[PDB]
């Protein structure tokens, strides 16, 4: 029901110099609008980067895209299925540029890929407002795991964009689902390290970080802007963030690879308490104690609960903050100290 639209800008490509896109819904009597960023790693040189255009081609090009994709989860327009906001104009913007969403730099002479994701967002923006969005009150821009990342590092560019483009009363805010990563040491040794493939895949995506965030941390250090407890309070769009406080892919670049023993299970709570800590000053936030990867586009994501509230109520709670509210919360992080002590969690 979301359906296919290619970029009327064909310079703004993916990888392979294909052009990037959108997938649409329209909601002929809403003003809300829901752009959702896709994830899936990244890569950074041109070793990876070709190992991936091997065996993951779609997240590298839009030659063999469908025409249409069904909506899941917060792209879902059945109730049922989305308490939040089923009736909103709904956009899924596939990642095909392999940068999280970081990218602005063309396939050339001097460059096998396009690294074009924070291009790509704009131009989406760009085009979706002759289709609706320039009578929008509030754009959602949400993104999971790369694409939560996507959303820290690009939300306030499109409040800018949309801005100097002459729609000030859009309210542009963030919702940014497992692509909150803490830079910690892993619990073996290995790459992988994080930081230092993020520092790599900069300087080959000619990546871009928000402003502020680069200001603070300049030349050469923007990989900090990556991750989410420092990028975070540089932002001014308001952002709901999701993390689960043991997430899959944390604990993958992390070495840990689950009968445990003590250095483990210190480890792992460890790991869940600096999670917890990190977002003791993040007013929307919904962590559960739970081992997990992703949770807005799936079809479940209802069922999981923090102290007796779910994700779509958390965020129904945070739209009505924006207008605390009794029996409404918008802060929802569980402090029980390991994976499944939530007995909301996923199942697998
Ligand atoms: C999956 C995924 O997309 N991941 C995992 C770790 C990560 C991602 C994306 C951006 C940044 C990071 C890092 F560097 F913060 F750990
Ligand atoms: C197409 O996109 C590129 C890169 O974002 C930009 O420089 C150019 O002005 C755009 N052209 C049009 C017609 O939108």
């Given at each position: 029901d979301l359906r296919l639209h290619l970029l009327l800008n064909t310079s703004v490509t993916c990888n392979d110099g294909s052009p990037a896109g959108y997938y649409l819904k329209e909601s002929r009597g809403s003003r809300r609008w829901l752009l959702f960023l896709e994830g899936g790693w990244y890569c950074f040189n041109r070793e990876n980067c070709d190992s991936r255009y091997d065996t993951m081609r779609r997240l590298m090009s839009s030659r063999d895209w469908p025409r249409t994709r069904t909506g899941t989860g917060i792209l879902s327009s059945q109730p049922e299925e989305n308490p939040?906001?089923?009736?909103?104009?709904?956009?899924?913007?596939?990642?095909?540029?392999?940068?999280?969403?970081?990218?602005?730099?063309?396939?050339?002479?001097?460059?096998?890929?396009?690294?074009?994701?924070?291009?790509?967002?704009?131009?989406?923006?760009?085009?979706?407002?002759?289709?609706?969005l320039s009578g929008a009150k509030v754009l959602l821009l949400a993104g999971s795991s790369a694409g939560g990342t996507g959303v820290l590092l690009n939300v306030d560019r499109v409040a800018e964009q949309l801005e100097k483009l002459g729609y000030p009363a859009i309210q542009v805010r963030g919702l940014a689902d497992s692509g909150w990563f803490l830079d910690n040491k892993q619990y073996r040794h290995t790459c992988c390290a994080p930081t230092e493939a993020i520092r790599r895949g900069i300087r080959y995506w000619n990546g871009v970080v928000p402003e502020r965030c680069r200001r603070q941390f300049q030349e050469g250090e923007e990989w900090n802007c990556f991750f989410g407890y420092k990028v975070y309070?540089?932002?001014?769009?308001?952002?709901?963030?999701?993390?689960?406080?043991?997430?899959?892919?944390?604990?993958?670049?992390?070495?840990?690879?689950?009968?445990?023993?003590?250095?483990?299970?210190?480890?792992?709570?460890?790991?869940?308490?600096?999670?917890?800590?990190?977002?003791?000053?993040?007013?929307?936030?919904?962590?559960?104690?739970?081992?997990?990867?992703?949770?807005?586009?799936?079809?479940?994501?209802?069922?999981?609960?923090?102290?007796?509230?779910?994700?779509?109520?958390?965020?129904?709670?945070?739209?009505?903050?924006?207008?605390?509210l009794k029996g409404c919360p918008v802060h929802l992080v569980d402090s029980c100290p390991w994976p499944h002590c939530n007995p909301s969690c996923p199942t697998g």
């Open positions: 939040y906001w089923w009736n909103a104009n709904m956009v899924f913007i596939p990642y095909c540029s392999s940068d999280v969403w970081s990218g602005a730099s063309s396939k050339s002479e001097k460059n096998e890929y396009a690294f074009m994701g924070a291009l790509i967002i704009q131009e989406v923006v760009r085009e979706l407002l002759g289709r609706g309070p540089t932002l001014r769009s308001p952002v709901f963030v999701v993390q689960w406080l043991f997430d899959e892919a944390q604990l993958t670049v992390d070495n840990v690879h689950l009968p445990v023993q003590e250095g483990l299970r210190l480890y792992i709570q460890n790991l869940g308490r600096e999670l917890r800590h990190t977002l003791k000053d993040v007013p929307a936030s919904f962590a559960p104690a739970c081992l997990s990867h992703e949770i807005i586009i799936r079809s479940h994501w209802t069922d999981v609960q923090v102290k007796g509230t779910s994700l779509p109520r958390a965020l129904h709670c945070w739209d009505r903050s924006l207008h605390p």
